[PDB]
């Protein structure tokens, strides 16, 4: 990469508090809005 | 008693045949108006892509 990076990279799991009933639900309401429109 | 009955009797066959043909015509028209409707619905791929945009990925 023709240079020494300023910083390292880590798996970006900082916001790990992501629920499964929440993620599906958010996708659900995106769909219903589109289905109706 | 004699004349009108004889002429009605003579009429019967042609009328019967024409009415049979008319009924067959009605059935044929009923059949010809049947078409299978195919509806197009929004592809879910776009919905998934929009979901990604909301995810800010």
TrEMBL record, chain A:
<protein>
    <submittedName>
        <fullName>Uncharacterized protein</fullName>
    </submittedName>
</protein>
UniProtKB/TrEMBL annotation, chain B:
<keyword id="KW-0812">Transmembrane</keyword>
<keyword id="KW-1133">Transmembrane helix</keyword>
<keyword id="KW-0472">Membrane</keyword>
<protein>
    <submittedName>
        <fullName>Uncharacterized protein</fullName>
    </submittedName>
</protein>
<dbReference type="GO" id="GO:0005739">
    <property type="term" value="C:mitochondrion"/>
</dbReference>
<dbReference type="GO" id="GO:0020023">
    <property type="term" value="C:kinetoplast"/>
</dbReference>
